[PDB]
Design a protein around this ligand. Structure first.
Ligand SMILES: Cc1ncc(C[n+]2csc(CCOP(=O)(O)OP(=O)(O)O)c2C)c(N)n1
Ligand SMILES: Cc1ncc(C[n+]2csc(CCOP(=O)(O)OP(=O)(O)O)c2C)c(N)n1
Ligand SMILES: Cc1ncc(C[n+]2csc(CCOP(=O)(O)OP(=O)(O)O)c2C)c(N)n1
Ligand SMILES: [Mg+2]
Ligand SMILES: [Mg+2]
Ligand SMILES: [Mg+2]
Lengths: 526, 526, 526
């Protein structure tokens, strides 16, 4: 008779899973014992760092990732990272261990109380099974709920005595099941949409993160060339969906109600693909749209379609809808739009560096197929203007605004794409939230590059206190941190850059190295 | 007309509050502006470190502490620390900022979705108000629910546009309200209990953490001297409730069902005060009690009284019940029990240190009124046998077993007791969960001592894999960390100890220093 | 070996339970089979009627009641009745059946999905056990959580295959456990309260429903005679706590903010016992209290103490606090207050009846130890002025305002007090919500009297539309119902009254009858 342990590892290998991300405990020892030789284990020193590494690996490979944590204390330390995963639509399977079934009622040490309620309201599905023989059917529901459109995180809690009991022999029917959500709009209604696009006199296009997740980038290039139309990215962007030096590209939209209606004035039809309508930030009251403009939206999430304050909407898969529209529209006889001008070069003495100077130097020296990550909050507009990104899968930024994402996520992307060089740009404030993730890069020899921007302050918060007219606020400055000593503590090589000739030398050394490297850069205090 | 901002800071000063523990954000700038000169602000670099410092300050002062965090991402990073606060009964008031009321429905950047459900099921009370004028009445309910028996943590969420609006003038009736739960059992039923204690022929006493929280230690010494009875501490102990070298004291109980019924065999009446019945750990099946033994329990928590599997129970305040019993019982004519023997000295060469040798050296050199903290998981039984603790408020250990408590909590205790020296003993594994808290000690010049026990492994997990017969488990070792380099990174002085003569020299230097100090100790690999 | 079925019925008989209230189903047949001869079963035809009958029985006997329902559909039909039970503090144990453990995951017919979340937020405690051997320990927690101060309703869900399995032999330690919450304030603080009462120059007293629940009525009479002080009942009253023709009694308080501060002007100390502060209804803005008045409150519920907008508070048992204060205060030398005048008699022709005429006729003819219930919404002030109620346990009204309480509750009170005659007064609108409860009185021969007040309209709603200035509202009238035909349908004797001489004859017949009786009365349309 096969055990619950033997039946569960056979379901995982037949559904394509071969890696476990974790930090271990008492309640997990009977799951992890006798570990099979066709799987690999990746250790990290804190639970915010475990979930960040797994999130980077899933976004870059376009497939689900598997995680194992300890009871209530371990699940609780990770709830900030699960807030970023809800808004990026990331497919993550989260498991945690519970006490033996005979000692839950007396509340022994290590018991998880009312367990399915702890991660609500951040997850798609949450459960604790009623018997040992139900555990393989519960793992089947979790795999399929994470992978169906719209994609997201899920939770399962298991008592430690279940793994050594006998399984149900009829569980073999689960092993090779296949589920599809790859759908598009009916022929009669799709015909009405194409006729409206073919007769517009001044059209415009807006793109979001679900375009890069689906690999629909090349189909969106064909659509803009046929219509002869300008292209923008939607506000607070988590990914890059279009080549940034193509003649149709206009850059990042402003995040206010009145600023967006003035930008769209004079366009008769506006088409949105794979974004919310819209992720606003500052308070800027006015009109949602001006007279003469109509809007149409395509999305994978029913909650996005319901909460929009203007326009018509369609709920379907982004890959199947983009392929259909690109191959049906006519070639317009209008002329192609003109490419944006070359950015201005700013004046630089032989002391402390301007942020504009750091981005121009990276664009001259790095390879054409590099991957970038951003957690430098006061410099985002300059980064989008000065880096040429030609290929898919080339940019990531925290999707819900939560700090502690970019340092551990850069280690996960480099393990999924071993032939492309990864480069993470991070502020002095943001670097402390997840500092212990540096140990995982040194132990498994993963060659990421980390660039630290040191200005001595929480820079974006001083800017916003100015616009709200708020005086005498405490806690805005962070003096007296040595980032070269923190790297030596966890086993990582460290370099420094105080002027332009030191910055050029340090980047050329880092491109040649066989292990991970950190560089500390002195930047101008606003 | 007074504003909501002016009315809320007047309610806090009249109820005895003068300190704020925090990490700031966009949604909190209109609460923190114009900060008043009779309050102080304490900054930390991550939200697990903010809540740990506040928990140490509240436990040592015996009064409530006030906290301020940013939206869903900040609340989520702290949920592991709120798991420890539920089981220790700590009085903590947690506030977080929300988006402007006109932009919640469209879900703008920084919106907290279904906010009151996020920290359930860990808190006593959770709420988001319906209008700006209701905010001062909501802060009144939060202060009183945290302070009533049984004490615990609470949650409030506030939209940022509420602080500048007009208050209700009838809010002045809140300023000086007083609420009491200081109660004990009726005269007729208390008389029946005292008669049963006076006629027992071989009584025994068991004590828990709610005795030290109430300062009832001296009343429990008088009770044991009158009855002439032996005294134990209940399993997995979070605090110390009795002097450890008094002749009646027998030490820490074992954590198994069968081991506890054999220890109590031959005692006719057993009295428990201020503990659960009981916090078991390992699986050890048998009898709850043997024939001839009856049990009676006094507790402040109705859920503790309901879930016990044996005995009678009384629900009341621990301070008022201990004072009443101590002054009513008769003097027995039995002889006082004999004191425990002096511990054995183990053999030591001039290389790597045994844990037994480290505890004997601290007992010879430290002052008589020192305070200790423990997060060295494989050495807890040796620590309770070898340290003489004469006074109240002298020991703290993680109440729900969650790692990341002792390093930040040691900084909070030293700020509440500036005339007593604090000394924290911590393992190589446990030190990484909350490492960035070291910056807060250097910036505010708080003189704590940190002792690190370096064996290269997760030692308690290797021991338990032996007893469960579990072979080929991954992720149990942590090589290649330099703890002297991590201290220099955050601005803290560092020393080392590789033999007995180096350990004696390093402790004498640390007792003289005016700022914080870390010592790295080489210990024997099991 | 004893089964789970045998062990559970032995725990119920040793804790004092001998009656089951229910409506049966598929999932409950293995609990109800082999029913033991020392228990009785009471059937009703709908689940709102089952819970109403049990609520009346528990309030009149001052002990807990046991209930059994079918899965999600049966639990759902009863949630209006559980809203009334939360605000009256009623001790009710609610159980429901679930599908076999092997078919919960596939969601077979009759499965209850996420079961513990369904009755939140109305209950004190809610749970579904992890194994068959845990079921007797889960029933122990439910009995004790319902009975501890403050008292209220609880919920347990059980899979049908658990009842025939082997029990744990160590479950015998549960059978005779005893838990007490009978507590009062410490000697030093009680002394400060008595000194403030002894030196007041014009005191006043206010009483709520927790006084009648505790049987503290005679101790509150002694307190008012010693202080020489006037006595009021708090607004929207669910029970009667004082004799209504004693010289100190002043009647029912108005339900507005400004109306209550003007009534208390000139009183220096106001003492509240066993009520919320206060249950307001209409909008009436002004001062909470006027200059020269201080307030002090005694309550059994921490949420009542936290939410009051003015005064000091004490949390303790109502029976133990009333006995202590009554025996400690001094005899004042002031003169006793004067009794209220005899009510005015209104003019009556020989046609349709005024409500004032119906209440004067009941006070002349009924016995001195009768029990009354009220669900006639537009006539409550006239009922409190015209009925003389000398003894405890003599009045009940819906505690949360929810219609469908009084008809089934009158059947439960008559089964607990077989030597006192019960008389229920009910409106034409209110009688339809729970009409099928009439069958239970006829089948078990329970002799309640039902008086129906027929005016053809929702009378209280027409009055409130006048004060809000609301015109052209639909759905306010209910013509064409025959209440004598509905009684004959369910097997109950029926009489009628169209003038004063027919009303006197019908009441004298009903006082003599051996079974239940309904009387239909024609009343004046406002
Ligand atoms: C968990 C969490 N805590 C706090 C914040 C608020 N926050 C927004 S921007 C910022 C400052 C980041 O400073 P730094 O990385 O040095 O970049 P700079 O602004 O100096 O360019 C902070 C603290 C947040 N978004 N998430
Ligand atoms: C947040 C959290 N993660 C994981 C654990 C599981 N855990 C229990 S003891 C232990 C090992 C601690 O090792 P160290 O501090 O070096 O002490 P030693 O056992 O070597 O004496 C771990 C990881 C936990 N209790 N809490
Ligand atoms: C379940 C429920 N539905 C509706 C109401 C609203 N309601 C309050 S008073 C009332 C009218 C009752 O009319 P009737 O019993 O004839 O008495 P009358 O007002 O004519 O004296 C209604 C419907 C309620 N309280 N509970
Ligand atoms: Mg900065
Ligand atoms: Mg170790
Ligand atoms: Mg009516």
């Amino acid at each position: 008779m096969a055990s619950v342990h033997g039946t569960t590892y056979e379901l995982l290998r037949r559904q394509g899973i071969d890696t476990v991300f974790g930090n271990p405990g008492f309640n997990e020892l009977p799951f992890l014992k006798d570990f099979p030789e066709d799987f690999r284990y990746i250790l990290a020193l804190q639970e915010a760092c475990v979930v960040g590494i797994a999130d980077g690996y899933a976004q870059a490979s376009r497939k689900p990732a598997f995680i194992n944590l300890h009871s209530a204390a371990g699940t609780g330390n990770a709830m900030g990272a699960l807030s970023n995963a809800r808004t990026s639509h990331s497919p993550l399977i989260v498991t945690a261990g519970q006490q033996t079934r005979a000692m839950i009622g007396v509340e022994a040490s290590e018991t998880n109380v009312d367990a399915a309620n702890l991660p609500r309201p951040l997850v798609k599905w949450s459960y604790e099974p009623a018997s040992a023989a139900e555990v393989p059917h519960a793992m089947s529901r979790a795999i399929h709920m994470a992978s169906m459109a719209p994609q997201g995180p899920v939770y399962l809690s298991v008592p430690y005595d279940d793994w050594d009991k006998d399984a149900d022999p009829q569980s073999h029917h689960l092993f090779d099941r296949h589920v599809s959500s790859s759908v598009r709009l009916n022929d009669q209604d799709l015909d009405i949409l194409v006729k409206a696009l073919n007769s517009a006199s001044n059209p415009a296009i807006v793109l979001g993160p679900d375009v890069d997740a689906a690999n629909a980038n090349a189909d969106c290039v064909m659509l803009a060339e046929r219509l002869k139309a300008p292209v923008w990215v939607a506000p607070s962007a988590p990914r890059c969906p279009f080549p940034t030096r193509h003649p149709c590209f206009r850059g990042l939209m402003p995040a206010g109600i009145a600023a967006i209606s003035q930008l769209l004035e004079g366009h008769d039809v506006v088409l949105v693909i794979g974004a919310p309508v819209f992720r606003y930030y500052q308070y800027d009251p006015g009109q949602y749209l001006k007279p003469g403009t109509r809007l149409i939206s395509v999305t994978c999430d029913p909650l996005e379609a319901a909460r929009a304050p203007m326009g018509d909407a369609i709920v379907a898969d982004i890959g199947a809808m983009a392929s259909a529209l690109a191959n049906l529209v006519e070639e317009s006889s209008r002329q192609l739009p003109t490419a944006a001008p070359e950015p201005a070069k700013v004046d630089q003495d032989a002391g402390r560096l301007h942020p504009e100077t750091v981005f121009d130097t990276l664009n001259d020296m790095a390879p054409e197929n590099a991957i970038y990550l951003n957690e430098s909050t006061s410099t985002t507009a300059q980064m989008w203007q000065r880096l040429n990104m030609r290929n898919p899968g080339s940019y990531y930024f925290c999707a819900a605004g939560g700090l502690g994402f970019a340092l551990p996520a850069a280690i996960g992307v480099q393990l999924a794409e071993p032939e492309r060089q990864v480069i993470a740009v991070i502020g002095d404030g943001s670097a402390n939230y997840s500092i212990s993730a540096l140990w995982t890069a040194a132990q498994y020899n993963i060659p990421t590059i980390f660039v630290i921007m040191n200005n001595g302050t929480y820079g974006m918060l001083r800017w916003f206190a100015g616009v709200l007219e708020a005086e005498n606020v405490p806690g805005l400055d962070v003096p007296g941190i040595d980032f070269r000593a923190l790297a030596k503590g966890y086993g990582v090589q460290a370099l420094k850059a105080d002027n332009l000739e030191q910055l050029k030398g340090s980047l050329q050394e880092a491109l040649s190295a066989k292990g991970p490297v950190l560089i500390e850069v002195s930047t101008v205090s606003p």
